[PDB]
Every structure is written in C-alpha cells, then in structure tokens.
Design a binder for this molecule. Structure first.
Ligand code: NZ1
Lengths: 156, 39
C-alpha cells in the first residue's frame, strides 16, 4: 500500500460519511498511533493491510507491522512543534513551549493546545524534526481547556 | 473498517504559529490509561 514516512489520517466509514478518528506516524515501515484511536483493530492502506504488532492501554499506544520505532525525547527546555492534523483541515505546525505533568512515577512533557478529538495521534517534534511523542491523551484543567501529555513509546 | 491517508511530511517549519502556555499540573494515570487532576 503506502509505507512512505510521514503523518497520516486514520479514517472510518462505519459512522455517517467518512470520519477522521485519529492520526498516526509512519516511520521505518512501522505505523504508530494512540490505542484509543484504533482500539487495536487492523488498518487498511489501499489494497495493503496493517496488523497490530505491539500495544498497551495504560500507555495508550499501538504500533503496526513492527515494534515501536520512535525514541526521541523532549529535552525539558526547548520549544517543540505540534504537527496538528485536524479533521477536514490541512496539516499545520504549531510551536509551543511544553508544560509538565507531574506524576507519582515522574514528570512528562505536556502540550496545552486544544483540537478536535480526531486530531489524537498527531506528532510532537523537536528542532531536528524527530518525533518526541504523540498528542491526544490528557486532561481538562480548572480553566476548562485541554492539556495533552507528550506520550512517547519505548524502542526495544 | 479503518483506513489511512497521507497528510504530510514530518518536518520542523521555521516561523510557524507560536501559541500555547506551559502549565505545571499534578496528575494521576489509572490502569485504563486516563489522566486525572490530583488536588
Ligand atoms: C476539550 O475536550 C477535549 C476532549 C477530548 C480531546 S482529544 C483532543 N486531542 N483534544 C480533546 C479535547
């Protein structure tokens, strides 16, 4: 099918019309997305088929055709770009300085940009163009606005 | 059934829309992968 590196929209014809349920990254022949986007189900790419290979509900991640390939990390200091791919709208880079999700298991970067739910799985980048995580799993703060984590997998 | 469609390249773009704040939150992550605010 289409295994070119890049950002992709995850679509479904199961609801009314064609609906964008999420977004994923294709890197080294491995498609990467959030678990709540696909629920682990198989994906189509033209005539080709992508079957899940690794997944974890707590991490809210899943990889197709191979192990998780993305291992770059936010340095805790620099600005990053959210390559937001919203439903029915063009891919657009948005630069921000991440906040912090302080947990009992440690700190995680967090991007405070709000987008439709079908934007989940849009990659967050460093100044070199490396995917430091996926956008789309977070919280709704005192203000009522959305703060997503910078969710990164593990390269075995 | 679900299917994918390419939406672009993964590249950093100079002079893009700079927006968003940087908050420090106390969060908790449950077994279902959902985040919640701890206060
Ligand atoms: C403001 O509420 C929400 C709820 C769910 C999602 S998924 C996403 N990427 N952004 C949001 C925002």
């Amino acid at each position: 099918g289409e295994t070119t590196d890049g950002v992709y929209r995850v679509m479904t014809r199961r609801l009314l019309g064609s609906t964008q349920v999420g977004v994923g990254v294709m890197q080294e022949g491995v498609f990467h997305t959030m678990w709540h986007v696909t629920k682990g189900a198989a994906l189509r790419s033209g005539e080709g088929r992508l079957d899940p290979y690794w997944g974890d509900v707590k991490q809210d991640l899943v990889s197709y055709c191979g192990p998780w390939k993305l291992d770059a990390a936010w340095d805790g200091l620099s600005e990053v770009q959210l390559l937001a791919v919203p439903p029915g709208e063009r891919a657009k880079n948005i630069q921000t300085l991440p906040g912090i999700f302080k947990t009992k298991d440690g700190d995680i970067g967090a991007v405070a940009l709000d987008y439709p739910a079908g934007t989940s799985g849009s990659p967050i980048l460093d100044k070199c163009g490396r995917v430091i995580g996926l956008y789309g799993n977070g919280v709704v703060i005192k203000n009522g606005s959305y703060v997503s984590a910078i969710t990164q997998g593990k390269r075995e | 059934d679900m299917y994918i469609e390419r939406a672009g390249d993964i590249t950093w773009e100079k002079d893009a829309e700079v927006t968003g704040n940087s908050p420090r939150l106390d969060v908790a992550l449950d077994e279902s992968g959902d985040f919640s605010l701890v206060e």
